[PDB]
Design a protein around this ligand. Structure first.
Ligand SMILES: Nc1nc2c(ncn2[C@@H]2O[C@H](COP(=O)(O)CP(=O)(O)OP(=O)(O)O)[C@@H](O)[C@H]2O)c(=O)[nH]1
Ligand SMILES: Nc1nc2c(ncn2[C@@H]2O[C@H](COP(=O)(O)CP(=O)(O)OP(=O)(O)O)[C@@H](O)[C@H]2O)c(=O)[nH]1
Ligand SMILES: Nc1nc2c(ncn2[C@@H]2O[C@H](COP(=O)(O)OP(=O)(O)OP(=O)(O)O)[C@@H](O)[C@H]2O)c(=O)[nH]1
Ligand SMILES: [Mg+2]
Ligand SMILES: [Mg+2]
Ligand SMILES: [Mg+2]
Lengths: 428, 426, 426
């Protein structure tokens, strides 16, 4: 009965999405052909007799990344109506994606979305994968987001965004991109989750013991996290956490809706034999500064709310104990106005593992999405970066050429600045 | 989808093209007749960008060859992959410039250009959506400079919304071919300021240096140089022609490395460069590739890069690489050289990764930098011009074509201004 | 059903016919004796339109050959497919015009015409329902002009309800054969205004141009020209002789491309035209065919078509083609060239498609246009006439046959009026 629509924007979204799809397929016992040799009804619709098509829309302004899917193993899973393709790319620019190029493609996709959306009956909410630093992932997303409030509004939305790093970042004009695209995110998006590549890389190195990671290792990691959000829908545990419920729980104010994720345990195949995975230990792992998905400092931060989601072999008896222990500890700390700050989910289904996967096959797993003042400090340096770039009108002429007025920049920076103080106000 | 027609000019540019084209064919697997013999399927999905699929499965190069004399076009036909080119596209005159930009730009070139201005249109029509034009010529003489310069500005009237690349060869102080280099350079650069989007300034003096020490070649020729230069070209447009984990096309690159309107001159670089001796013993890994790349003597522009700071920096890596290995190295380099990167544009790095490598080599690196050390290249030229222009020497050849002595100082002033723009932000 | 008898005149026209006939035979598969050797069955269902089926399965050409001297008829018999022609149909005199329209139209031609006026009748009787006459001659001399002109008007008395085609060759300024071209042209055109339904104005100056550049032929002859010209003829009447997805006969074409009574002069064009070099590398697809077709230098009329607008435009395509590919291209062209099509007749295009192509070629395009650029062809002629007529030069040859100096100005005036009709609607 329940249903949810996935959207994938830009190259990053596409790249991430494939892995997720694969994971999903693995979960429900479906080969690339789309015929299974119920629970899966949410993401897959059964066409006629034994053809499982995904709830998906891949947008891209190049053909390269989309044609990668059309020629590979998952050629049979999708059809050309689902896979939309542009001509001229975003070219790592917000202005190209939103104003000039964005008019033509969005129109095509909205109809498609409607066709997909009206087919399903129980719309839970949307998922939108992209990157803030990316061209298509910023300019188009903003447009798209704006559009989606007209047709739906109250129907929920989520987005798992690749946040830019201060040290290890693979593009020069990223500062600009972030600042602009966050203007639409505050008004339209209900709750956006944030991940940083640098953070991931460290995790990959230290715990998995693979000193040569590439994007395919990160994508897999991300997919697990994604699953851990939607695992409550597709399987019937003793206690359940729907998306609306989650939203109600984690997000306190209209301005703040930027929690950060974390995932544990993540360890090698050889390390699983020695390491006795206890519940308490895994709980601890979520609160460690080393295992966070964003470059942040939990020591400075304070958790307003955070939603735990267990899957595998778990029961409430020791969960309670775990909860209590954390509360007792003073290294972890909360804001004065929130005495009780957790939302706890359980699931019987164990988390699956991919053929030739870096992660070990485990009984238990955890995913904590914490709203905090730790991520408030992350944009203070972003602003600084941005400001310097702007101060001498660097890279501005390109933007101007694409139809961006000069006041736009003023609007987006000031707003950002204003927002930074909000966290402070809340946490006083 | 996304096509790029290629233009060529001058004695050197044409030669470069001849090799470049060959190299590109080798990369995809096209033979002298044109019929495809390759095995890897991904060579055929982006064949359309540099090859029109003609009748009978015989692919043809989307090119325009220009010259003011018929001499250079003889050896291009007789050489390897001269038969692949279309007979229609060759354009040539019977007069010749005579190492004079005044003759080349106004009188001699303007009679020939109207044939090319009709030929390019057809090419444009042919492809679905053209994204930009590549151009290959010299600034030393009059033929490649005067013609190409004349052409490139008239493209901006018809096609204002397209990206414009220019692969030039500027003069050196030591290896001076002609006497009137300062003149030609001074006037040819003027038009390349406002009309172009990006330009790669190559110099032969550096190439020679690269050859003698690094490659350990006992008897270099121009062929070697051509091969080298072509490699760079191949590198920049690799992301269009093949798939990758992180793709970066031309427009993106332009956006990233050109912060201001008038400061867009780049300096190319290539790695790994290995001799027969160093092929065995050099451990080709990412860090190694990196360090070699940022050396002052490994550049193709004959300057001292360490006199000033890099405004921006980008790289295009090829072959399968781990990203934590790739993205860290750059960061490390930046950390090391905190006095050789601009401070008010923090995070100067741009990276791109392709899955299909060059045939033979495991990995490769194409370095495109933007620096304040291009002042040294221009300053010398300016000085030379001053030395020349003081006594009005070699002037009656230029004044004979209807050019006032003010018209020299108009361009000179512009050049000076351009030069100053680097010393504003240094 | 639906037959067309062919008429020929003049030294050039006859030659053209000789080749045209051969080409048509080749197309259907008729041999020198006349017996059929072909394989494709659709060549035999419309054989009746250009060939009477005689006794013993030997087909014969429905033709009339006219001349004022016996010289040209010698080489026609000795050449290829001279034996197919019927001995009865050859008509010839012993006098000759001598490059004079006055001698040709009144004295010399009127004695010969009464034989032809009896011969054509028989031909007419023979077929079930004749739909029109094709006519091939020149306007430069006196033989092809004076005779043909004399003839064509007397057909309108007997057969007023039939379509009338005329394939002429008007004079060029550079390649001037005779001195008295302006005279002959001026007088010969007068009668072709009111009497004809459509006329194709060919010029050799353009043909030469076409040959040198496009076909890359080192040693052109008149044979080549003949071959070319004949192709056009073959193209226009393809829909009658073979089946098609969208058929277009002569009458339809006439209706479409002749908006006004006095403006019916057309300009022929042919594609694809390819050399030995361009045969391999040119991608023969519909768009390619289109673009080439509308080029100013690809025309058979030596003018500048882009000085004015096309009043109407039609095309006849051959071989199997997708219609969305075909019908779109024209539209695209129209969109592009919004300043080179008349605005108050929106949608100027006419298309026709045949299933049977030419032997060897995959596709073909015959371009028939009606433009205001025919002013340039006539204007020059008028000027020349004026230059000549001012001093009464070369007049005693014309006045000797009983023609007043007023009778020149009567035709001249008419010509002027005709010329003006183009500049009314430009
Ligand atoms: N990398 C290469 N550089 C070359 C080659 N030939 C010449 N050059 C360099 O280019 C400079 C001369 O360039 P050109 O001969 O093309 C001058 P241009 O053709 O534009 O005018 P004309 O010589 O009057 O036709 C000179 O300083 C040489 O160092 C070559 O084959 N490869
Ligand atoms: N396409 C061709 N054009 C020709 C040929 N021969 C001549 N011509 C052209 O036609 C023009 C001469 O035409 P004619 O010789 O037929 C003049 P006509 O026969 O009517 O009178 P007489 O020559 O007095 O018999 C001249 O301008 C030539 O350019 C030919 O074989 N093919
Ligand atoms: N974690 C992760 N990050 C990625 C991946 N691909 C790209 N990124 C990040 O996203 C940024 C680049 O954004 P892209 O998605 O390439 O840009 P885009 O929005 O597609 O715009 P165009 O490239 O112009 O089409 C970089 O900072 C990368 O670090 C991936 O597979 N995994
Ligand atoms: Mg992209
Ligand atoms: Mg030269
Ligand atoms: Mg004659």
């Amino acid at each position: 009965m329940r249903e949810c629509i996935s959207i994938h924007v830009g190259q990053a979204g596409v790249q991430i999405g494939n892995a997720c799809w694969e994971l999903y397929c693995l979960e429900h016992g479906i080969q690339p052909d789309g015929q299974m040799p119920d629970s899966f009804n949410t993401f897959f619709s059964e066409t006629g007799a034994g053809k499982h098509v995904p709830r998906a829309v891949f947008v891209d302004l190049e053909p390269t990344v989309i044609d990668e899917v059309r020629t590979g193993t998952y050629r049979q899973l999708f059809h050309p109506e689902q896979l939309i393709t542009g001509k001229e790319d975003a070219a790592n620019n917000y202005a190209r994606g939103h104003y000039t190029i964005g008019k033509e493609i969005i129109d095509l996709v909205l109809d498609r979305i409607r066709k997909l959306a009206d087919q399903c009956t129980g719309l839970q909410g949307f998922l939108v994968f992209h990157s803030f630093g990316g061209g298509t992932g910023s300019g188009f997303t903003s447009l798209l987001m704006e559009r989606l409030s007209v047709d739906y509004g109250k129907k929920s939305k989520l987005e798992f965004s690749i946040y830019p790093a201060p040290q290890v970042s693979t593009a020069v004009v990223e500062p600009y991109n972030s600042i602009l695209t966050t203007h639409t995110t505050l008004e339209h998006s209900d709750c956006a989750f944030m991940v940083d590549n640098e953070a991931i890389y460290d995790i990959c190195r230290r715990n998995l013991d693979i000193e040569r990671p590439t994007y395919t290792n990160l994508n897999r990691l991300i997919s697990q996290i994604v699953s851990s959000i939607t695992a409550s829908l597709r399987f019937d545990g003793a206690l359940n956490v729907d998306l609306t419920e989650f939203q109600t729980n984690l997000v306190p104010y209209p301005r703040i809706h930027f929690p950060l994720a974390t995932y544990a345990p993540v360890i090698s195949a050889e390390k699983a034999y020695h390491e006795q995975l206890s519940v308490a230990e895994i709980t601890n792992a979520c609160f460690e500064p080393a295992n966070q998905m964003v470059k942040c400092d939990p020591r400075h931060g304070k958790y307003m709310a955070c939603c735990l989601l267990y899957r595998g072999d778990v029961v409430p008896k020791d969960v309670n104990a775990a909860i209590a222990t954390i509360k007792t500890k003073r290294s972890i700390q909360f804001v004065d106005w929130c005495p009780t700050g957790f939302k706890v989910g359980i699931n019987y289904q164990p988390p699956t593992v991919v053929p030739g996967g870096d992660l070990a096959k485990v009984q238990r797993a955890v995913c904590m999405l914490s709203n905090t003042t730790a991520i408030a400090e992350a944009w203070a340096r972003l602003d600084h970066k941005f400001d310097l770039m702007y101060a001498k009108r660097a890279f501005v002429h390109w933007y101007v050429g694409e139809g961006m007025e000069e006041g736009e920049f003023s609007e987006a920076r000031e707003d950002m600045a204003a927002l930074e103080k909000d966290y402070e106000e809340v946490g006083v | 989808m996304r096509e790029i027609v290629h233009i060529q000019a001058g004695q050197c540019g044409n030669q470069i093209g001849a090799k470049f084209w060959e190299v590109i064919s080798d990369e995809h697997g096209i033979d002298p007749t044109g019929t495809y013999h390759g095995d890897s399927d991904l060579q055929l999905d982006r064949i359309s960008v540099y090859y029109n699929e003609a009748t009978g499965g015989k692919y043809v190069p989307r090119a325009i060859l220009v010259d003011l004399e018929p001499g250079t076009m003889d050896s291009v036909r007789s050489g390897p992959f001269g038969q692949i080119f279309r007979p229609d596209n060759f354009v040539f005159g019977q007069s010749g410039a005579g190492n004079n930009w005044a003759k080349g730009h106004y009188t001699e070139g303007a009679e020939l250009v109207d044939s090319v201005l009709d030929v390019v249109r057809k090419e444009a029509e042919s492809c679905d959506c053209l994204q930009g034009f590549q151009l290959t010529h010299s600034l030393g003489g009059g033929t490649g400079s005067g013609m190409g310069t004349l052409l490139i500005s008239k493209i901006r009237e018809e096609y204002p919304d397209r990206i414009m690349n220019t692969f030039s060869v500027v003069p050196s102080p030591k290896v001076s071919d002609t006497v009137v280099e300062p003149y030609n350079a001074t006037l040819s650069v003027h038009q390349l300021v406002e009309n172009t989007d990006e330009t790669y300034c190559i110099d032969n003096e550096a190439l020679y240096d690269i050859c003698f020490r690094t490659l350990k070649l006992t008897t270099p020729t121009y062929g070697d140089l051509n091969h080298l230069v072509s490699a760079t070209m191949s590198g920049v447009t690799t992301c269009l022609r093949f798939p990758g984990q992180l793709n970066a096309d031309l427009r993106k690159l332009a956006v990233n490395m050109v912060p201001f309107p008038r400061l867009h001159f780049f300096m190319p670089g290539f790695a790994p460069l290995t001799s027969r001796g160093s092929q065995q013993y050099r451990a080709l890994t990412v860090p190694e590739l990196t360090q070699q790349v940022f050396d002052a003597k490994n550049m193709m522009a004959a300057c001292d890069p360490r006199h000033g700071r890099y405004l921006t920096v980008a790289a295009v890596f090829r072959g399968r690489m781990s990203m934590k290995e790739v993205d860290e190295q750059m960061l490390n380099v930046q950390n090391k050289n905190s006095s050789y990167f601009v401070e008010w544009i923090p995070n100067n790095v741009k990276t791109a990764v392709c899955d299909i490598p060059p045939r033979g080599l495991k990995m490769a690196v194409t370095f495109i930098g933007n620096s304040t050390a291009i002042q040294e290249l221009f300053k010398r030229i300016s000085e030379q011009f001053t030395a020349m222009f003081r006594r009005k020497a070699f002037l009656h050849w230029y004044t004979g074509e209807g050019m006032d002595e003010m018209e020299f100082t108009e361009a000179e002033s512009n050049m000076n201004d351009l030069v100053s723009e680097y010393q504003q932000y240094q």
